[PDB]
Design a protein around this ligand. Sequence first.
Ligand SMILES: [Zn+2]
Ligand SMILES: [Zn+2]
Ligand SMILES: [Zn+2]
Ligand SMILES: [Zn+2]
Lengths: 1452, 464
Amino acid sequence: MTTTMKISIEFLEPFRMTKWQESTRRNKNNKEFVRGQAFARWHRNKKDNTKGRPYITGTLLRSAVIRSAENLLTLSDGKISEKTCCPGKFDTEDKDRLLQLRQRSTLRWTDKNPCPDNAETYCPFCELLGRSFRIHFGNLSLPGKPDFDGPKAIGSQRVLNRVDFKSGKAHDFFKAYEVDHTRFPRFEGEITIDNKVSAEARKLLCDSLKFTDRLCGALCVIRFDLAEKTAEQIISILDDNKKTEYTRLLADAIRSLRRSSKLVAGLPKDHDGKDDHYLWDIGVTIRQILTTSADTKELKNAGKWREFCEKLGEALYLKSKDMSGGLKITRRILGDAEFHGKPDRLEKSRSVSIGSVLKETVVCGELVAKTPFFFGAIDEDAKQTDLQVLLTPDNKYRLPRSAVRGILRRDLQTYFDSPCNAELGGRPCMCKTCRIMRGITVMDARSEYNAPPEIRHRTRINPFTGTVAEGALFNMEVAPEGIVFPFQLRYRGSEDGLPDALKTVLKWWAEGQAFMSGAASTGKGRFRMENAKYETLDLSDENQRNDYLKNWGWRDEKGLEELKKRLNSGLPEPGNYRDPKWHEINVSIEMASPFINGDPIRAAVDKRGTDVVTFVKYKAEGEEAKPVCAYKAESFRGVIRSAVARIHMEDGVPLTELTHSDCECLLCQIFGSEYEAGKIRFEDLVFESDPEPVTFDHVAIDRFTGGAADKKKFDDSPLPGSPARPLMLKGSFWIRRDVLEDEEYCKALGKALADVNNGLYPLGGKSAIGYGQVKSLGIKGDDKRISRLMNVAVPEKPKTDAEVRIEAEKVYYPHYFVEPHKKVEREEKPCGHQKFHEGRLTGKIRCKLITKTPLIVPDTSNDDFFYHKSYAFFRLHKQIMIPGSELRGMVSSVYETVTNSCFRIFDETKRLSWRMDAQDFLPGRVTADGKHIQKFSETARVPFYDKTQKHFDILDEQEIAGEKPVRMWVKRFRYQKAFQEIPENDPDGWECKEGYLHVVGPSKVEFSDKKGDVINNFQGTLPSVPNDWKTIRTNDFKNRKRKNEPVFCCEDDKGNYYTMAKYCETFFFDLKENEEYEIPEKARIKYKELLRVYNNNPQAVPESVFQSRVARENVEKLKSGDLVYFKHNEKYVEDIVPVRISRTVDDRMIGKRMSADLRPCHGDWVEDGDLSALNAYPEKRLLLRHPKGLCPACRLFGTGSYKGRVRFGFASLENDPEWLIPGKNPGDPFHGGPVMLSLLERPRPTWSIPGSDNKFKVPGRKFYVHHHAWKTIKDGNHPTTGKAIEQSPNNRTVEALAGGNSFSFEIAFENLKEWELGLLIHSLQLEKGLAHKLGMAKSMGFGSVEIDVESVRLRKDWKQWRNGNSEIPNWLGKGFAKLKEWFRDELDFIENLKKLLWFPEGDQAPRVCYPMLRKKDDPNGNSGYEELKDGEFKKEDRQKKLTTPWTPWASS
Amino acid sequence: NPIRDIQDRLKTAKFDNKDDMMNLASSLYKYEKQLMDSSEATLCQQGLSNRPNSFSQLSQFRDSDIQSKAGGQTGKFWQNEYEACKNFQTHKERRETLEQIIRFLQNGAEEKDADDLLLKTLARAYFHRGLLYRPKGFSVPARKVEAMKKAIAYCEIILDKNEEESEALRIWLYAAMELRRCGEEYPENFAEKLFYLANDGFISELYDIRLFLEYTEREEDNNFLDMILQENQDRERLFELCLYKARACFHLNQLNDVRIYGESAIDNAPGAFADPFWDELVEFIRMLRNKKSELWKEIAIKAWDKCREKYWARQRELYDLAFMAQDGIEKKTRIADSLKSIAVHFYLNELESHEGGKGGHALIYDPQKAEKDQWQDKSFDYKELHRKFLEWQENYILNEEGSADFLVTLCREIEKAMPFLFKSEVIPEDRPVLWIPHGFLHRLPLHAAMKEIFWERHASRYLP
RNA sequence: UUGAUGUCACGGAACCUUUGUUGUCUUCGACAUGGGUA
RNA sequence: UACCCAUGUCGAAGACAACAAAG
Ligand SMILES: [Zn+2]
Ligand SMILES: [Zn+2]
Ligand SMILES: [Zn+2]
Ligand SMILES: [Zn+2]
C-alpha cells in the first residue's frame, strides 16, 4: 500500500522546452538531447506528426528536490526532526548506463560514512534518494492533457548566444523553446510514497518541495495537497491598373498603420484636395478598402487591427519579392549552427562543505529605459523587418532573464577586471564572477506598454562615391524609451549581505549606466534602476528558515506584495567602489539651415502629402506614445565616423580605404569593427524647441525645353531653420574612460569634431541644396580633453567683350538656343569622397546677389495669398530668402554651357508627334491575324449627317461599326459619292460595289465661346447639344447660295457655340486580299502613342459627341478588322492613322534626335527594347551609362551614383525689401503689392523640331534674354498685344521684389581642382554687362540678377583656414586654359552664351515678346505664329534662326 | 576595371562555347563582388560601348540553362586550380579562395534542378574548407564539424538518386572519416556507404587508401591490401603512403617490412604537427598495442626521437607511448623532463590511468647503490589522490578555515597512495630528497606527507 | 510522457559593423481638331 | 483623284532612377 501526494507547479516566468527527439537519438551521444535534459519535454501522439502536448519529467523534479534537500540538510547540520542524515551515496559502478553524471560538488553536512548497502533502516536522506519505489516522482503534465498542432502552438523558439567578454561579440549560440507562463502556468503531477517511508523523510521531502525555487529554466511555486482576402483584392487592384512598382511601398505604409485605425481617415489626398492620391486611389480603391476594414466590427479592437495590418503588410511584402524573382535569403557559409555544451563524465563525486551560514538578499526596484532599447529576436515567419525586438505573445515588451544575467556577468567581470576564460561543460568554474553568479536570481520581466515598435530605416554609405552601398538598406524595430520594467534580484550566499562587486554593479545601474540591450553603439538599451529596495534574510535561523519555507520564499504575487512591505529603501553602500567605465559627453549643435532626416514611409501616411518628412521618435509616457522630432543616433554616429576616418591614415593608407581585417587602427579601436564592439556610443539628438515642419516645392527643369521635366515634381518637409531662428540640436554620447584617457584617441575625436564644427560635415540629407548646415558644435563633460582641438579684396570681374546690336524697329524672340560643341569630355573615375586629396581645393565661397529686374520666387505653400492662384515671395521665419536649390540649378545650367557637357535634365523617352495638313496614306483593313493590313482600292464619301438619305435608320449596328461588309451604289463622275440607295433625283450612272464603312462620328467641329459668321447668320434659336452622335443632322449651310458646305450649329448650356462642318463618311471598297502588308512592332508603338495623345488632350472639345471614335470611345490598341489609313513600304507598313487627317508620330524618341554624347551620362533606355529582362542582375546599370564616364557637370554637381562636390546655401535679403508694387497697408513695409502676370504655358518642342526629317536635331540649350517687359506687365497690360491682362484660372498673381535688392549666400566646395574652381567662379560672377536669370516669368523680363564674389576661404588643414582671394585670377586662368585645351579656339558656344547673357545697356530697351497665334489677334500688326510658320520661320531655316542669339522675328 | 573586362568578354563571345561562358560568368561575378564590398573600383562610372549588341549578348547569357551550366563549370575550374595551387597559397589565400567558390555556387544549389556538378563541387569545397581548421588544444573547432556535416548533406542529395555515384561516394566517406577524427560518431549509414565502395578501385587519392584500410578492419577480409602495396612511392607525400603500407603489411602478416615502412615515415616526416600524418601515426602505434602485437615498442621510441628533434593534443600521448615503450628507467627520466619545461622524478601517464593501471610513476635514483639497483621504478594510482586535491582546492576557496580537515586527509592520501616514501629501502634515512614534480603534483605538498610528517626524516627541495 | 544511489543549463547578452542617403531651378506659347469642293 | 484649308482654344509636370540588407 502507498500514498499519493498531488503536486502542482506554478510557473512565474516563461519556462524552456526542448525539441522532440527520435527514440534512437535519446542517448548520451546526442549533444542536443543531453543539453535539453533540464528543460521541459515535448510529447508526440504519433511519431510522424508534431501534434502533442508538453510535459515535465519527474526525474528532473526529483533532482531538484534532492538538491534542495542537500541545501536544507547543510543549513540544519544534517539533522531533520530528531534523526541524523548520512551524506548519502552518489557513486555507481555501472556509470555507462547513466545518461548524466553529476558534475557539481555534493554538499557535506556530516563526516560519517554513508549508509551500508544492506541495512535494516536507512537515513531520511537515503530514503529520499530511494536506496531503501519508496518515493516515486510522477510526470507533470497540463491539466486535462490537451492537444496542440505543434510546439510552435504553445511557444516560440528563441536564439540564445554566448558573448565573448574581451571582444563584446557572440562566440556561438543555441536555441530553445520558450513557453509563456501566462498561457500555460500549471503542470500537475503526483508523488507516490510507500507507507514504510519514515515521517522524517516525508518532512524532508515536503521542505525540499517548498524550498525548490526554479525548474525548467523558470522560477516556480510547487504546492502539494480577412487579411488574406484584402491582400488578394489589393494585389488584383495593383495588377489590373499596371501599378506594381508600388507594392513594397504599400506594404510598408500599411504595416505602419498598425499603431491606430484612425490613421486611415488621415491618409493624404492629392495636391488639389481630392481623392486622387497616387498610392491610396489606384483602383473600389485602396483607400476605400482600408476605410471599410477599419470600420469592420471585428477590427474595432486595437490588437486585431494591428494583427490585420501586420499580416497585410507581410503578404504584400511577399508578393513584392516575387516580382524580383522571389525571396532569397543569403545564408552564412560557416558558423550558423548551434553549439551545445558537452558535460564531462566524471567517475566519482566531490564532497564540499559550504558551512551553515546562508543569507538571502532580495533587491526590488524598477528598470526604466532612458534610451530606446533593442532586444534582438528574429521571427522566421516575419520577413518584412530585418531586425526585430523581443516581445511577449500579448505584444508586450519583454526584458529577458538571459540578457539580464549576461549583462550582470559582464559587469561583474568588468569590476573584477578579470575575464572568465571558461568553457561549457566540466566541473563548475571557481572564479569569483561565477561564484557570485551561481547565487544570483533575476526574474524575467515585461511591460504594460504594448504599442507597436517604431521601424527605423538604416543604410551604409559608400566612402568613395558618397552614395548608398550596394545592398545597404534595412529596417530596424526599436522599442520606445520611457518603458518601465519591474526589477527583482536575489542573492543567496554566505556573506553578511551582497558582495562588494554586486553592490558596485547595482550602484552603476542606479546611476543610469545600465547598458542591457543590443545595438549599444547607436545608443540602444541604457536603463536606470529606480526606487530600489533591499533586505537580507538569515536562512540559517531556524525560525526564519521555517517562515521562508511557509511562504515559498515570497516568490508569488501575494508573497512578493507581503515581502515588499519589509524592504529597506535604497541600496547597500559598496565598501570597495570602482567608478563606472563609461563617461557621458554632452553635445550642442546649432544649425542655421533647414534640416531633414528622411522618412519616406511616414510621408506616405501623413496628412501633409509630401514626398519625404523628417524622422520622429516615440516616447512611452506610461500608456501613451509621444512623437518627438529627433536626429537619429545611427546618422550622427555615421557622420562622426566619416569625419574621423577621412582625416587619419594607417601606414599611409586612409582609414576609409581599409578592409579592417586584422586591423588595429584608431577607427576600429574607437568605433569598433565587425570583429569587436566599439568604445563610443551615440544617442539620439533632440531639438531644444519643437519646430513645425514646412513644405518646400521643387521641380526639375529640362535643359532643352526650359520647362518642368516630366515625372519630376516633388517637395520635402524639413524642419525650418534660418540665421534669425537657428535650430538647436542637443544630446549626448558615451565614451569609455580608457579611450577618454588616451591622448591619441582624444586628438582624433577633437580633429573630427573641429572639422564638423567648421561646417564640412552637414547633418541629414539634401545637403546639396543648403540643408543641414552646422553653424557650431559644442562639447562638454570631457574636461577639455576633446574640446581643446575644437577652435585681400576680391579682384573685379572683367568687362565683357560681347556686343549685341539692338534696333528699335525690331521685335526679338524671348528665348534662343546655344548649339553645343561636338566634343564632351568625360572621365571614367571621378574624384573619390574618401579623403581630402592633395592638389584639390576645399572651402567656402561667399557671394552677393543683386537683382537688376523684378524677381519672382514664389512661396507656393499658400496659393491664395491675395480659381486664380496668388503667391507671395519665398520666406522662412518672416525672413525673405531664396532657396539654395534654385541658385544651384541656375548656376548649374551656366556651368553645363560653359564646360560643354551633357544635358543633365532631358526627357530622352519623349516621342514627338505632328498634325497632318490638308496623300500617301491609303485605305486598309486589319486582317483577322491582327499583324497584317489589306489595302483597299478606292474610296467614296457617304453623306451621313444631312437630310438626303436615312443611312443611320436603314443600316445596322454591325454595318455602322464596319465589322461586316455592306453593298452601296458608287458613282465616279468628278463626283465620288456612295449612296446606299440610288437617289430619286439622279437614277443614271450608278454602279454597285461591295466594301466596308468607315464611320467615326461627327468630329470636324469648330467650337468657341463667342459667335462667328456661321453662328450669326443662323436664323432662330440654336438647338441644344444632342445626347447621341447618331441623331446629329445638318441645320444650316456655310455657302447658302450654292446649298453646299452643310453644318450643324448648336449651343451648349455653358455658353459654348459649336459648329460641326462634317456631313460625309468614307466608304472603303474593292479590298485586296493578296496585298497583305506586315505590321512591325515599331508601327504598333507609334499607333499606341497616337492613341495616347488622342485620349489625353487638354484642348479637346468639351462635348464627346464631337470627337472621333478613337477619342470618344477611348480606343487603347489596334484590333483586328479596324479600318485605318496607312502608308507602306514594299513589305511593311510605316504609319497608321484612324482618320483622314491625323497625327504623324515620330519614328524615334527625342533622345535619338541629338548627339549621343550630349545625352545624360546616366539616363534612360532609348534603343528599341524592353531592358526588363535584366532587372534581377547588376549589369543592367551598365547599359544606362555612357561608355566614357561622366561629363564635367556630372563630376561636379553629381549624379544618382556619384555624390556632388558643391553645396549651395540659402540666399538671405540684406536690407529692407524694395517691392515692385507698394502694399495695401502703408504701415507694413515687409509685404508688397500684387502684380498679375500673363499666361505661362508649356514649352513646345515641336516648334524647335519642325518635323520628322533627320536634319531636324535638338537645337541646344534654351536661355532667356534680358529685357524690360516687366514694366508693361506692371502697368497691367499684355506684353505682346498691350491689352489689359484679364484674371483667369490659368494665370497667376505674384508678389515680386524690384531691382536693387541684395542677397547673401555661401557655396561650399570639396575636392575641386583649380580649373574647376576657376570655371565655377566664372559661371557665378560672369562679367560686367552679363547677368543671370532666376525665378518665374523669365520670358517676361523678370529675374535678371548679378552675382559678385566677396570672399573665398580655403581649408589648408583641419585647424587652419586661409583666405583665397589672392588666387582667384590664377584659378580663372587655369579654367580658361582647360577650356582651350578641350576646345582649341573653337569656342563658339561661349560667345553665344555671352550674347544670351548680355544685359541691355542704358537707353536701350529691346522689344521682346512671343508672337500671337494669328495676326488678327495682334493689335500691333505683327505677324502671328501661323504667318511665321510659312514666312520668316520656315521649317527649312527655323533652327538656324532659333540658334542665333537676338534674331528678330518682326520688322515693325 | 571590371567594366572593361566585361566589355572584352562580350566583344568576342560564343554561347555554344564553354570557355567563353565561363570567362563571362567569372567577369560578371567579380564585378558584382566588387560592387558589394564597396571597393575603390566602384568609382568606375562608365558603361558598355555598344548598347544594342551588349544588351542582346547579356540577355542571351542570362537565359536559364546557359547561366546554370556556366556556373557549375566555373566552380569546377576554380576547384581544380585550388587543388593544385593549395601548397603555394597561404592560409588566408586558401580560405578566401574556397569561400569564393562556395558563394558562387550556394545561390543555385537550393533548387531541385541543380546539376550534380554543382553539388559535387560545393560539397568538395566545404570538405576542403573544413580541413583548413587547425585543431588547437583538446577542444575541436566547432566549424570543422559543421563544414563536414554540410558537405555530407550535399552528397546525400546525389547519393539518394544515384547510390553508386563515384565522386559523391568518396566525399561522403571523406567527411565521415573527419567527423570521427573530430570526435563525432559515424553517420547513420556509414556501413552501407563503405560497403558500396568495395566494388571500386582507387582514384590515386591518398584519402582513398585509408578508406579501404578501415574496410579491412571492419569485415576482417584482406582482399584489397595487395592492391595497396603495389603503389607508386615517387609521390610527394611518401610519408603518408609508407604509413598506410605498414598497416596493409600488418594485416598480411608482413612483420619485417612494417619497420622499414615505419622507418621512412618517421625519418621523413613533416615539420608541422598539424598535418594529419601525426594523428595517423599515433593511431598506428595504438593499433599495434590494442592487438597485442609486440612491435609498437620500437616504432614509438623512434617516433619520439623525431618528434623531439622537431598545441598538438596527441603530443602528450606520444610522450606517454615512449615512456611505456622504453624499458630503461634512466632513459624514461629524460622523456619526462622534456614535458615539464636522492632525486625523485615524477611523471603522470594519462594513457595508463584511462586503462585502470597505475599511471603515476615515481623514478627514484640513488647513486650510492649499484648500477643494477641504482634506478627504481615505483608505480602508483593517482586517480584517488587527484580527487582529494580537488576537494581541498574547492573547500579552500568556498569555505576558508574549514579546509584543514581536507588538507590533513590530502596529506594522508599521499602516503597511502605512495607507501614508498617512509621506507628506508626505497629511500635511505637522513638523506636529502629532491622533488621535481609533474602535473598537479606541483601544487600538492610533498614535503608535508603524513603517515609522522615527511620533513621529520628527509629534507626537501623543489625544481620547476 | 521519465526511472531513480549522481542533471551547476539561473553553465551561455542574438552579440558585433553600417549616415535614408545620391541626382533634380515651382518652372513655362503655339498648339488642338478633320474634312470640304469639284 | 486633283485642288482648298477651316476653326480659336488650352493648362502641363504632382515624383522619377538606384539600393530593398550584406557581413
Ligand atoms: Zn545515509
Ligand atoms: Zn568563471
Ligand atoms: Zn581599422
Ligand atoms: Zn553628364
